[PDB]
Amino acid sequence: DNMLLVDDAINDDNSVIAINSNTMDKLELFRGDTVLVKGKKRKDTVLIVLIDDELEDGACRINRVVRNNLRIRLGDLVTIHPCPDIKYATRISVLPIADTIEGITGNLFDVFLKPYFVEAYRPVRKGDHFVVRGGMRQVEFKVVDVEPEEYAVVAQDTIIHWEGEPINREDEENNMNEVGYDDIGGCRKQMAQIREMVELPLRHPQLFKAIGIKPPRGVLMYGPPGTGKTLMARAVANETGAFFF
Amino acid sequence: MQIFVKTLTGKTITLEVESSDTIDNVKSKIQDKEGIPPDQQRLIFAGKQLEDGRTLSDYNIQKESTLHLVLRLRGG
Amino acid sequence: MQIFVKTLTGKTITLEVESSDTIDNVKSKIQDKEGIPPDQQRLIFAGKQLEDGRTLSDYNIQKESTLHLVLRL
Amino acid sequence: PSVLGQGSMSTRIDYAGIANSSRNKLSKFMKITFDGEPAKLDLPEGQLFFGFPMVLPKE
Amino acid sequence: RYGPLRIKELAVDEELEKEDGLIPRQKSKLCKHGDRGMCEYCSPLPPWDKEYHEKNKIKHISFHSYLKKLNENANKKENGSSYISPLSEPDFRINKRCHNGHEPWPRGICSKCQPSAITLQQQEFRMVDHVEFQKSEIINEFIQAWRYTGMQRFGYMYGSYSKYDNTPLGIKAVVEAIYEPPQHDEQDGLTMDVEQVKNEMLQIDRQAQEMGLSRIGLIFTDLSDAGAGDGSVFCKRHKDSFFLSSLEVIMAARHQTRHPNVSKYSEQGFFSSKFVTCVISGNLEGEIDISSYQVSTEAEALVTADMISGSTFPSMAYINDTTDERYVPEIFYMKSNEYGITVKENAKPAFPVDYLLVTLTHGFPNTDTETNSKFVSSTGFPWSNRQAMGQSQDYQELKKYLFNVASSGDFNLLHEKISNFHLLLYINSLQILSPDEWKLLIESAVKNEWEESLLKLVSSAGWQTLVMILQESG
Ligand SMILES: Nc1ncnc2c1ncn2[C@@H]1O[C@H](COP(=O)(O)OP(=O)(O)O)[C@@H](O)[C@H]1O
Ligand SMILES: [Zn+2]
Ligand SMILES: [Zn+2]
C-alpha cells in the first residue's frame, strides 16, 4: 500500500518525490502535497509529492541526498503518511559543511541558498541534508535548527541564520553510531534474546498490560572481551529508538 | 460630537457637543455636571488658553478630541 | 467628610472632616490625633500646596479623595 | 548617645529583655553584654535592626 | 533533552560563555623539551586555577569560570553519557510525595525522602564580581538623606550588568540610579510594609524596564556619628564583630530567591540570582566607605524552607525546630583549624553567618576614561519618597526647576536637565503625556544622538500642554 518502492529521482531537488499515478490514487495523495516519508532506522523526512506516470505502480523516485538521509538504498520500501499540520519555519539556523565551502568567496548564503528557498516552500527537518548547485559549485548543508521544531516549511518570510563556524565532515562518519543489525553478524541467537527482552517491553507495552505481568528489568550480558557486547547494546538501543543513556 | 476631558488629577469623562457650537456650551455642561463655575473652569489643548467666546471650529478640534481642565486660581 | 492623607511615616490615614470647614480645622484634627504641630506641616494635592486661608469647597475636594503631608518648620 | 543599645526599636522590642530572659531562662515559678548564649530574636519580614551594642575594634 | 537545554538569558552570559579564558604561559626555565611541545608548566592555565587567584589576591572564582570547570570535569563529547546537567540549585524541602509505601511526611517517612544532614561550607564562586557606581552623587545624595534627618535609610538600586576584565570571566553590576521605597525609618532601624512596597516597586520596575534599567540590588546605611567635631563614624562592622547581622542576611537571601538568574545549564533553568547587597558603615577611620556582599547558594535555599531566624548575638543566626510542614535536619558547618585540617562542628543552637556570605569589591569608574552614563543627574529634582525632609515633588518644584530653561531653549541645558531619573518618573506619574510621547521622551533623555528626538518631543502637543500648565501653576 504505502510501502513505495525506492528509485533514483531524475531531479536533484531535496524536497521533491515523484510517485506513480496509481499509488497517488490509492493513498488519495496529490501533486504538490507535503508528506512524511519514513525509511529505515526510524529516519523520517518531509517531501513534496509530484505525480509522474513513468514510474511503475507502487514505485517512487527520490534523489541521492534523501536516500542518504533516510539511510536506505535503491529498491527499498518507504512508508508515506499525510503531513497536513506542518507550519512555516519561523527561523531556520543552518551552517554549511567545511569541506564543501573551501575556496568560496563572498557571502555563501546569498550566492547559494537565497534563490533556493525563496518561492520554494521546501519543508525542512532537523538533521537533514540539502545540496545547492550554484554557478560552478555544489555545496551540501545541514538543518541544524528549525523553529517551529522539529520541522517546518521554509517560506519567503522565514529568517535563515547562516552565521556560524564551518562544520567538520568527519564527525558524521568517524562517529558512526546509530548502527543497526546490519553491522552485527554471527550472533543471531543472543541478538534475538536481547531484542525479545528489550524491544517488547518498550515498543509494545500493551502486551504485558493485557497479559498482566511486570516485565523483567535487568539484563546482564557477559563473555570474552572484544566480542562486541558494547556494539550489540548500542545497536539494540539505536534500533529501539529509546533514550539511550 | 464625542469629546474627552481630563481633570487635573486624571479623571477622564466623555462629553457631547457640536463643533460649531461655542466651547462655552461644553464648559457649562462640565460645570453643571460637576458644579465648576465658568471662571473656575479653564480648558487647555496644545498649550492653548481655550475660552468660552469661541467654538471648536476655530481650534480645529473634532470628535474623539481630548482636552485638559485646570483651575485658574493658582495652578492645578 | 471622608478623606485620605499620606502621612510622613509612609502610611495612609482616613480622616472624617466636612467639606465646609477651613483646612486649618483639618490640620488641627491631624495634629491633635498624632501630636505633630500644624505650624510646620504642609498639605499637597495635585502639586498645589494648599494655602491655609481657604476651605475644602474652593478646591472642590471630592469624597474619598487623597492628599499628602510634608514637614517644614 | 542612647543609640548604643537603648533607643528606638530597642524599647519597642525588649532586646535587653530578650537577653536577660535568656540569662535567667528557667521556669522559676539591667545590663546587656555578650557573656552567654544567643536567644532567638525573630522580627517580621521588612524590619532591619541596627541597634546591637557596638563592639569597636581591637584598639 | 538529548543535549544542552534551550533557554534565553542575558547577553553578558552568552558572550562570556563564548570565550574560553585560557591564560597563556611562556617557556618556564624548568622545561626540558624543544620549542614545540609542552610538558606540564608551559600549558595554558585554566581560568579557574586556584593558585593564580590566591596569588593575584582574588578570593572567588568568577562563576562563569566555575561553569567552565564543571563542564570540563565531565560531559565527554560524542559519547559517554547523554548530558547530565552540571548545575543544580540546593533544595531542602522534604518531598511530600515519595511513597515507597509510606504516607506523606506528617505521618510517615522512609529513608529515601528524609532530608540528609546539611554541611555548610564557605562558597567559592561569586556570581557578580564588581559593583560599580557611575557617579558618586548617587550614593552621596543617599547619605545626604541621613545627614539631614539623622535616621537610617534603605533603597533599591537600578542598573545593568557587563563584563569585567580584571577577573577571569568576571562580571560587574553598573548601578545608574537609586530608588527609595516608602519606609518608616527610625534611629536604630527601619520598617516598611512589604506588600505596599512590592506593589509600588512592580510599576516602578515596569517603568525602569521601559527605560532599559533593571533592579540589581538593595543598599542601606548603618551609620552612627561619633562625638568628634568633624565627620567621624564608629566602625561597628569589621573582622572583630559581624559584617552583616542575621536579619540582613535573611533579607538578602529572600530577595535573591525572588530574582532568579535564568541560566541554560540547570534542570530548572535558574541559579544563584545576581543581586548584590551593599552596606554603608564606615571603615576603621572616620570615612563612610561602602561595602558589598552576597549570601551563598545554601543560605539562599536554606531560608526558602524557613530553618533560620535572627539571634540576639549579631553574628550568629538561630535555628528553628521541627514541626509538621517543616523538617530541619542536623546542620554542620565545616571550617579549617589552624593546623590545616577540616573540622565539622554541630551547630544547632547558633552558628556564625560568615559561612553564608561571599564578598564583592565596590568601586567607581576612572575619572578620566569614557563616560557612558545614562543619566547626568542626581543633583536636582527631589527624590521620590523624601516626605520626611523638606523634599516634596510637586508642580511648583517643577516650575522652579525646569521652567526657565524650557521656556527659552538651550537644548544642551534642556537635555542635561531632562535626563534625571526621578524627574522622568514623576512626569510619567503626571500622565499628561501619551504612551508613545513618553517613549520618545525617554529615548531622548536616556540616549545619545538625541537631537531629532528632543525636537520631536518639543514639537508635540503634549509637551506644549505640560509647559502651559507649568506656566499656569505658580
Ligand atoms: N559483529 C561483531 N561481533 C563482534 N565484534 C564486532 C562485530 N562487528 C564489529 N566488531 C568489533 O569488535 C569490537 C567489539 O568491541 P567490544 O568488545 O564491544 O568492546 P567493549 O570492551 O567495550 O565491550 C570492536 O572493535 C568492533 O568494531
Ligand atoms: Zn615545558
Ligand atoms: Zn519516602
Numbering used by the authors:
A (entry chain C): 33 to 277
B (entry chain K): 201 to 276
C (entry chain J): 101 to 173
D (entry chain H): 230 to 258, 281 to 310
E (entry chain G): 107 to 580
Q: Can you quote the paper on this entry?
A:
The Ufd1/Npl4/Cdc48 complex is a crucial component of ubiquitin-mediated protein metabolism as the universal segregase that removes targets marked with polyubiquitin from complexes and membranes. It is composed of the Ufd1/Npl4 dimer adaptor, which determines substrate specificity, and the Cdc48 hexamer, a AAA+ protein that couples adenosine triphosphate (ATP) hydrolysis to protein unfolding. S. cerevisiae Ufd1/Npl4/Cdc48 was prepared and incubated in the presence of 1S1UH-mEOS and ATP·Mg and analyzed by single-particle cryo-electron microscopy. More than 700k particles from three datasets were combined and segregated by 3D classification into three major classes of the Ufd1/Npl4/Cdc48 complex: no ubiquitin nor substrate-bound (“substrate-unbound”), bound to substrate prior to unfolding (“substrate-interacting”), or bound to substrate and unfolding a ubiquitin (“ubiquitin-unfolded”).
